[PDB]
Design a protein around this ligand. Structure first.
Ligand code: K
Ligand code: MG
Ligand code: MG
Ligand code: MG
Ligand code: MG
Ligand code: MG
Ligand code: MG
Ligand code: MG
Ligand code: MG
Ligand code: MG
Ligand code: MG
Ligand code: MG
Ligand code: MG
Ligand code: MG
Lengths: 159, 58, 296, 169, 215
RNA sequence: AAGCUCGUAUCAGUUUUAUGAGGUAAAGCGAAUGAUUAGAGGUUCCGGGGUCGAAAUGACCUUGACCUAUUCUCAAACUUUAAAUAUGUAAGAAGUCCUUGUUACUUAAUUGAACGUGGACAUUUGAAUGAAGAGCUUUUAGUGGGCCAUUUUUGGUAAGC
RNA sequence: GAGAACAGAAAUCUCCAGUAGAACAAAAGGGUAAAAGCCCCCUUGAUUUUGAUUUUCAGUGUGAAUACAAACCAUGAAAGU
RNA sequence: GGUUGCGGCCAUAUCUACCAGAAAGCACCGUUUCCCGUCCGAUCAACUGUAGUUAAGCUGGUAAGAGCCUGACCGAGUAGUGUAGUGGGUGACCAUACGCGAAACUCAGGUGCUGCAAUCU
């Protein structure tokens, strides 16, 4: 018969990152999680309690609850044709603070600074990010860089 | 008389006909799973804040 | 080397090294996790450890909180500071452990402004009691005993330092069944034996026994007592006056630090071999190769 | 020219591995308790191999560990049985050495039929000061190569002390 | 009653080796892979000739054994038993399966059709890629034509396309002949068995002195 | 189908940027596990034998193993490494920061936690592209035998299986 | 691996090496080394109350599991569990 | 800069073989009356800091060292792969187009960094 247990097909997912087995370092427990914090879920196979289901491995959610040894994380799970809210109770060994918003946070700080300097100096902002632009014109010198002519090589075996 | 057993064929098309809807975020989410000790103290704190702000209307 | 030394390349490649302080045999990380890990619903509250260590010739008593960058010392007390309070011998015995615990407790309470409140057990009688919170006042400074790798035995100097810190006004949760005098056959501790140990009674009784017995052993041990004119019966009042002085001024006047740190570094650098450069390594390799004009 | 790399007897272990676990084992325990002067410990079997009737956890052997002057005295007493002669093969590569005697009764009190006759196994573990580094709880370390006990050093120590000799290699 | 090899020519299945999950696999037909003067030193046989696959297919152990026997027999009777070292460089590790519908017309009465059709181990085959060397043979340059003809004879025992390629390496080493000659005159090559060991500029100078006294 | 609430508007089978997750393709096997070819150097203690040796293993040879450094070839239920495609999250006014009120929670402690009162910050309000708009609800039909093509892929010699 | 009477290839003792090549009831996979393994000491948290949550999923049930709350306890020096 | 206590990251820190280490610290080390634990004061407990030593631990250095770490127009834009064609080929498979892009290999460099407190020729 078929087998779909809780930890089915987790053989490599919940493995211990070769040469990184054993005790969890203390920074994991020294991190502090607040309601509203964004966390990535990655189960530690050595901590069998408070473990996420395999579906949430690699999912990023928001902390909604803080308990003695665990946090509650809000995930949006695709079920059918819509998203359902799921609330996981995960021990802190299975989560870490997400850096998915740190770029935005430093961008907000830098944008505030740039706006302040703009309103103290003159009128120019350019606060929105821009995609990589097409390259501008450039002059390529041949001084010491005379073009070397290449040709396709004949076939040989070298076996 | 055997038949087909399973397929996810056409299921994503059906799902996307009315689309995968994002779950309509709200300000002030529910406090369903929040620690009850915290909720008890939160109720008392909010009641105290309400009383203080009621007296603050002068 | 041998058939089992110079381990294989695969063994070395796949070996996972323990944490450095586990390799050094200094940190029990299983115990440290449970000591350090704070209830997540407090979010900043440091868990303070009363770290008690016993080297040869010194007793270290620290109060330590944990951060990601590393442990932070709030207050520290060493038994080599006890000569300032009037204890110059047996700086690692049970009474010195009690004195160092009392000193760290008093110093920490003074640093936190909790010395006047939570005076502790000033009238030491060897009774088992914890520091009690004062009504309508701040709770006592709570610390948790950290014995490290020291074994838990009935009569250990680490629990002597625990008793000292608790009597000094620090709230250190603990039971009495590890103090000297705890009757393993019943459910109560002998307070007079505990007080004797607090005031060095076991050492003084040994001194009197060794005096009434063979005397060259009493001249080998306790030689400093004879040279300082410290009779056995004076140990109790020596430790009593030490407790009074500790409570009077637990303020940690540090040493004067002659030969300041720059000179310390300069002197230590002379007896310090420096790593050779890659040019020097290549030169030595070339010298060793050229040393074989023929073959040795 | 060696300050405190003084080879000395770490311990002496007297072993009697009886095939059985009853009165014979109790008698052997009495034998190696009487001369050791301390209560010995009975060792259980781990397998059920053949011809011995040994089962898992059957308490088929008895051994006793002695240190200090008593260990030296018992070692000298057994070297007198061996006539102060040993084989080079008796010396381990790690610097320890042992021998075996039968007819334990030739030393101390006599045959004692109520106790019987047993053979014994002397193994002497040698070390230098600082072996505690290996055995302590905190900061456990490994003895350095120069400080390690060697078969050559133990042979030299064993023929210097006890005025004994070894046999052909 | 062996099935024709066309039934198992192509690499249709994932690799199916003998393992703890098979435990019942017949023995390979080819058991000898090194033959000729397999003890000859690297210096003795500079020329290398490869029989090289030009298809992604499977070579049965029976075909491998037949080709090895044919090539060895030709090269032995023409150039001598010890004028070459021939190495089969593919091993039949893939187990072929057979779902047996044998005989006894009326088999619909005692046969389940395609129900439970998982086959039993039928034989072994080596899975070869395009360009993968099937046969290698080192010899003296004077024996080039004999060795090429031996490989050409063996080529008839295999399905698909194979090519005879004269290697630019020295014997069974991975060095081009000029490079091996340069290392040999520099003294950084030592005969170990039928193969050699090379001096490296890494490792302890003591051992690099003890072996390779090129200093 | 009926609509309803709005539309200064919201979102998206898409890209970008930032940040995670993965253990498949490939690759690897002088890296672990398991397979696997050969020779070489040591255990003749090798499992012992052949052969002498008066007899030993005493000297050889040997086949088998073990050890050492090499060598050929492999893995759906092996693996250090490890893609491409696919995939979670974020890219603001429900934001960033600042002052200080509530609590029976928490702290040694106005320590913090959460929620508040007050205050500053609209051209690009903070990537791209698009947006017959967005959101919401009720109620019902039919259907619940499928099949085919490219690619991935299992059983099978194969099949318009 | 090197040693020790009977004792041999396997019994017990000793040292050295030993990243787990062992063990953890059972299938297999994961996990685990001052432990989760082995031995010893004390125990009944295999308890009470009624909720929330995860997997299967219709986001029904059932089973199993997670994190709390409110009690009463066990253990430990203690943090804790 | 050395050292100790507690640490963070957890080999650039490990491993192998040698050499060196002033001051302090640490350590080995001395003792068994008391508490305590052992077959064994070896471990654990306690006492002395006194009798001794840097021998070992520890720390640092050395090694065309093993491992590990970092980097590379090194291999290799290779293997693989997303997309495309009424492309080639009997087929097996392959080439091309628009993209993404390894691992092994080779070479070069490196061999703990660092927080808090105390202490030191
Ligand atoms: K052919
Ligand atoms: Mg993983
Ligand atoms: Mg159907
Ligand atoms: Mg513990
Ligand atoms: Mg198939
Ligand atoms: Mg998989
Ligand atoms: Mg593959
Ligand atoms: Mg334990
Ligand atoms: Mg079930
Ligand atoms: Mg001692
Ligand atoms: Mg001790
Ligand atoms: Mg030295
Ligand atoms: Mg190296
Ligand atoms: Mg088309």
């Amino acid at each position: 018969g078929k087998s779909h247990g809780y930890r089915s097909r987790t053989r490599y997912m919940f493995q211990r990152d070769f040469r990184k087995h054993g005790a969890v370092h203390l920074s994991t427990y020294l991190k502090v999680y607040k309601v509203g914090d964004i966390v990535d879920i990655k189960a530690n196979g050595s901590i069998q309690k408070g473990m996420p289901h395999k579906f949430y491995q690699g999912k990023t959610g928001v902390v909604y609850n803080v308990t003695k040894s665990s946090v509650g994380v809000i995930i949006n799970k695709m079920v059918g044709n819509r998203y359902l809210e799921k609330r996981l109770n995960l021990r802190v060994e299975h989560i870490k603070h997400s850096k998915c918003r740190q770029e935005f946070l430093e961008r907000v700080k830098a944008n505030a600074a740039k706006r302040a300097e703009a309103k103290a100096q003159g009128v120019a902002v350019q606060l929105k990010r821009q995609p990589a632009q097409p390259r501008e014109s450039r002059i390529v010198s041949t001084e010491g860089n005379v073009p070397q002519t290449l040709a396709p090589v004949p076939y040989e075996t070298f076996i | 008389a055997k038949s087909k057993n399973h397929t996810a064929h056409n299921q994503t098309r059906k799902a996307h006909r009315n689309g995968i809807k994002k779950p309509k975020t709200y300000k002030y989410p529910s406090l369903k799973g929040v620690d009850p000790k915290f909720r008890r103290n939160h109720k008392h704190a909010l009641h105290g804040t309400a009383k203080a702000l009621a007296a603050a209307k002068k | 080397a041998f058939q089992k030394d110079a381990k294989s390349s695969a063994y070395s490649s796949r070996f996972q090294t323990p944490f450095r302080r586990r390799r050094e045999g200094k940190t029990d990380y299983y115990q440290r996790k449970r000591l350090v890990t704070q209830h997540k619903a407090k979010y900043n509250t440091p868990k303070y450890r009363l770290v008690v260590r016993f080297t040869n010739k010194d007793i270290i008593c620290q109060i330590i909180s944990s951060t990601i960058t590393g442990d932070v010392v709030l207050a520290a007390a060493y038994s080599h500071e006890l000569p300032r309070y009037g204890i110059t011998h047996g700086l690692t015995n049970w009474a010195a452990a009690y004195a160092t615990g009392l000193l760290i407790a008093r110093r920490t309470l003074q640093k936190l402004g909790l010395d006047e409140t939570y005076k502790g057990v000033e009238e030491v009688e060897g009774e088992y009691e914890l520091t009690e919170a004062v009504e309508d006042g701040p709770r006592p400074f709570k610390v948790f005993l950290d014995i490290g790798l020291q074994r838990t035995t009935t009569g250990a100097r680490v629990f002597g330092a625990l008793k000292g810190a608790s009597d000094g006004g620090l709230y250190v949760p603990h039971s009495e069944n590890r103090f000297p005098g705890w009757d393993f056959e019943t459910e109560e501790i002998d307070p007079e034996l505990l007080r004797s140990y607090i005031f060095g009674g076991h050492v003084s009784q040994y001194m009197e026994e060794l005096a009434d017995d063979d005397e060259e052993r009493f001249s080998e041990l306790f030689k400093g007592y004879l040279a300082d004119d410290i009779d056995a019966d004076s140990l109790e009042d020596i430790y009593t006056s030490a407790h009074e002085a500790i409570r009077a001024d637990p303020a940690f006047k540090p040493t004067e630090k002659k030969f300041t740190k720059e000179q310390y570094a300069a002197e230590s650098k002379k007896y310090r071999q420096t790593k050779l450069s890659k040019e020097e390594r290549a030169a030595r390799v070339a010298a060793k190769i050229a040393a074989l004009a023929g073959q040795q | 020219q060696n300050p405190m790399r003084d080879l000395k007897i770490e311990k002496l272990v007297l072993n009697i591995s009886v095939g059985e676990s009853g009165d014979r084992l109790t008698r052997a325990s009495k034998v190696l308790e009487q001369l050791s002067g301390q209560t010995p410990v009975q060792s259980k079997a781990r397998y059920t191999v053949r011809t011995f009737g040994i089962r898992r956890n059957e308490k088929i052997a008895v051994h006793v560990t002695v240190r200090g002057p008593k260990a030296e005295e018992i070692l000298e007493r057994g070297l007198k049985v061996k006539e102060y002669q040993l084989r080079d093969r008796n010396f381990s590569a790690t610097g320890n050495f042992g021998f075996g005697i039968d007819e334990h009764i030739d030393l101390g009190i006599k045959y004692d039929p109520s106790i019987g006759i047993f053979g014994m196994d002397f193994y002497v573990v040698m070390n230098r000061p600082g072996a505690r580094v290996t055995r302590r709880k905190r900061c456990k370390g490994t003895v350095g190569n120069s400080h390690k006990t060697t078969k050559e050093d133990t042979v030299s120590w064993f023929k210097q002390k006890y005025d004994a000799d070894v046999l052909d290699k | 009653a062996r099935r024709p090899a066309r039934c198992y020519r192509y690499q249709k299945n994932k690799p199916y080796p003998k393992s703890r999950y098979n435990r019942a696999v017949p023995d390979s037909k080819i058991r000898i892979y090194d033959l000729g003067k397999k003890k000859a030193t690297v210096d003795e046989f500079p020329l290398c000739v490869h029989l090289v696959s030009n298809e992604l297919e499977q070579l049965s152990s029976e075909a491998l054994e037949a080709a090895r026997i044919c090539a060895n027999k030709y090269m032995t009777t023409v150039s001598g038993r010890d004028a070459f070292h021939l190495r089969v460089r593919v091993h039949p590790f893939h187990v072929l399966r057979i779902n047996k519908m044998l005989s006894c017309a009326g088999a619909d009465r005692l046969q389940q059709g395609m129900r439970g059709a998982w086959g039993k181990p039928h034989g072994l085959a080596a899975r070869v890629d395009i360009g993968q060397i099937i046969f290698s043979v080192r010899t003296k340059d004077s024996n080039k034509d004999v060795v090429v003809e031996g490989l050409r004879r063996a080529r008839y025992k295999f399905p698909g396309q194979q090519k005879i390629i004269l290697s630019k390496k020295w014997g069974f080493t991975n060095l081009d002949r000029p490079e091996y000659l340069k290392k040999r005159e520099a003294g950084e090559v030592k005969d170990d068995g039928a193969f050699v060991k090379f001096l490296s500029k890494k490792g302890s100078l003591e051992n690099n002195i003890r072996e390779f006294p090129e200093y």
